[PDB]
Design a protein around this ligand. Sequence first.
Ligand code: NAP
Ligand code: NAP
Ligand code: BGC
Ligand code: BGC
Ligand code: ZN
Ligand code: ZN
Lengths: 357, 357
Amino acid sequence: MKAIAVKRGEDRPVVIEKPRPEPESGEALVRTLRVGVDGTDHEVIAGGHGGFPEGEDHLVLGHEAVGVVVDPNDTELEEGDIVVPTVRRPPASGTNEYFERDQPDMAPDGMYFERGIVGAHGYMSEFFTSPEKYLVRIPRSQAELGFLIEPISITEKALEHAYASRSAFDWDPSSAFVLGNGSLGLLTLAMLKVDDKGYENLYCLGRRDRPDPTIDIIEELDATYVDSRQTPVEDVPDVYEQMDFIYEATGFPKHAIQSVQALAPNGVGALLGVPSDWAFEVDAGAFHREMVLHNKALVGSVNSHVEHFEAATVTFTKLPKWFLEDLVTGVHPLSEFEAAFDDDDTTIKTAIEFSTV
Amino acid sequence: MKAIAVKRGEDRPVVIEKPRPEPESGEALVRTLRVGVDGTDHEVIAGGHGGFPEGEDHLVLGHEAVGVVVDPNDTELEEGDIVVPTVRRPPASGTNEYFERDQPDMAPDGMYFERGIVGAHGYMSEFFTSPEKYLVRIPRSQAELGFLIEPISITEKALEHAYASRSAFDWDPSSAFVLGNGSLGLLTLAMLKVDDKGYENLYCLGRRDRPDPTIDIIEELDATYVDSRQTPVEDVPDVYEQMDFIYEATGFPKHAIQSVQALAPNGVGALLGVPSDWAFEVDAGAFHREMVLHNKALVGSVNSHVEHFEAATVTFTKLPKWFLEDLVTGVHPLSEFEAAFDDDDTTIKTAIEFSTV
Ligand SMILES: NC(=O)c1ccc[n+]([C@@H]2O[C@H](COP(=O)([O-])OP(=O)(O)OC[C@H]3O[C@@H](n4cnc5c(N)ncnc54)[C@H](OP(=O)(O)O)[C@@H]3O)[C@@H](O)[C@H]2O)c1
Ligand SMILES: NC(=O)c1ccc[n+]([C@@H]2O[C@H](COP(=O)([O-])OP(=O)(O)OC[C@H]3O[C@@H](n4cnc5c(N)ncnc54)[C@H](OP(=O)(O)O)[C@@H]3O)[C@@H](O)[C@H]2O)c1
Ligand SMILES: OC[C@H]1O[C@@H](O)[C@H](O)[C@@H](O)[C@@H]1O
Ligand SMILES: OC[C@H]1O[C@@H](O)[C@H](O)[C@@H](O)[C@@H]1O
Ligand SMILES: [Zn+2]
Ligand SMILES: [Zn+2]
């Protein structure tokens, strides 16, 4: 079968050939339909995040996948089921308490692999296998955009933890601010529009000149576009308003620290970005004082698990159809796979199509 | 009646004379027994925190109080009830949603007064009044050390919020690290020893040379004393271990930021300190990366309310008797009130006695 991989020392994705895998007991064989590309994938290709499997000269890319079950083997899945795989798997040493208690998304560094990212091959191959417990059935009509279930699930987890942090008092937020206008930030903005908490005012930070299709999406959702070159995060309360909820999806470490100044009293910031190294002079006193005197919280979140994927299938149905059309700028057949890895301003969410249902 | 106050421009507490107050409808008259002194009081005297009541030349000090009801007026309290007052009261403008929903501890800057601290006279007077809703009845046998109920309640709130932040997954901590060896830090250390979460290893940060009575208390509780001059917070995981729970009670802003490096994966830091201004160069990337990739949280907390005071009466009963004896280094009659404001290394928790039951 064909697969899309990065090779050691090499800089770009290439096609390689590999044998079709065979499922072990408890595993199904899945034929890949479509696999998305996100900012983490680009960082993996560049060497900034993740790592190769032990003793392999390559890493098959891709972690946002949807496929169709072609051999259920000895599992309770059925032929033709549409499934989305979870990303984390036990490391070489074997299972541990995080996997045993069904919370691998909470496992620390060195106690997991992530398929397509660290220590294990991803899903950009014509076929893959996985244990049934890590395959989430989704409605058949979500198959075409089913690679979106994974990134939606990321936000489902982050919101669960951020909201838990505010559960000891009566918190009623009215404003939310998403930092970043990438595919995660834009998806999250749309999710916040339909969130049960009832946000009245939505804002999204970016650094683009008009005309720009990410700006168009933000404004079409009735949110306010904030240009960080004009209005830095710490200045936002003066120009706009204090934000009850902040979701950081830039990977820029200054935003992690400055978010505390933009937060309203009793607010929470959720941090999702995978950051680069960075040092600067911070007013630590201002950070400290705001956290304490105004009962603020900062919560970091990574990965997600089955319950979050399930929740994502419900959230998907609530998202506007125009939005899903505008977000996905290109779905490319395997013959033109290279195009999926373009990263210009007019490219938002891309995917590669391996096959159709 | 006599009261202990700081005067505008003046630098030390002095005795002043004031009329005995008369309770309005819904208020009781309370005869003060004992009033504690903490680090926040010292900061109030020095001008670093809080502020005077509008149009007054002085501020009566004291926020940690216990008293006996001498006139229940038209309330459901009884003559001779032992009560501890809460600290926050509505501002000049009147009630707001935080007071109406019974969560004044969540009110932001400018939407509350704190008695003895900001905008309203405290409890270091022979008598005071308060609304019944802000008077918490405590067991009569806790009267002598009843000024401890307030600081215990601070920690009851902080733990409620810190633990809420970890409630979306199965969190089982084994190690806790208290930053600071003041009266709040030491009380919190003892509370963590008896906490239901079942901490196995306790640690406390200070910067004292032996012999020192705070070090003795830490070790007598079977905790490990960590000298910040030898082992800074960020280095603690290398020398000792990563900490599941951190409680910051130093008011030093470097600790607010560096705590993230000492936290174990999935851990939380609670921030309580009232900080001074401070700026330094931080590895923001390291802060950001640890928060996200290891699902960490930071929660700030201030003040407390009735439910936390109630909980404190239960926690009080569980604290070792030797500990309460060693913590309270001096209870001073009003005739020697000045001694309560000494701040040498051998002075831990002090109080002033106005009367006895
Ligand atoms: N925690 C998790 O489980 C998890 C899951 C998925 C993704 N992630 C991470 O989350 C982040 C977002 O993912 P993504 O796929 O949306 O990545 P992305 O496509 O790279 O989006 C990041 C966006 O942030 C913008 N940005 C960067 N610095 C900015 C600044 N200073 N001011 C305003 N905007 C700025 C960028 O704008 P420009 O294009 O103009 O530079 C870019 O569009 C990445 O760090 C990714 O690795 C984490
Ligand atoms: N959030 C709230 O609702 C609330 C409630 C009560 C108190 N507070 C605040 O919480 C803090 C603690 O209260 P407290 O009454 O215990 O105050 P405290 O008596 O001043 O205790 C602070 C302790 O921290 C130690 N410390 C300062 N810097 C240190 C460092 N770099 N390394 C190691 N130890 C250091 C000090 O040691 P040394 O004596 O050796 O200098 C001191 O013993 C204060 O900031 C206070 O204002 C807040
Ligand atoms: O590698 C950190 C994170 O990167 C994201 O793009 C993936 O969606 C997550 O599953 C993963 O945990
Ligand atoms: O002023 C901030 C805090 O200082 C503390 O000492 C008091 O115990 C709290 O009631 C108060 O909210
Ligand atoms: Zn991703
Ligand atoms: Zn206090």
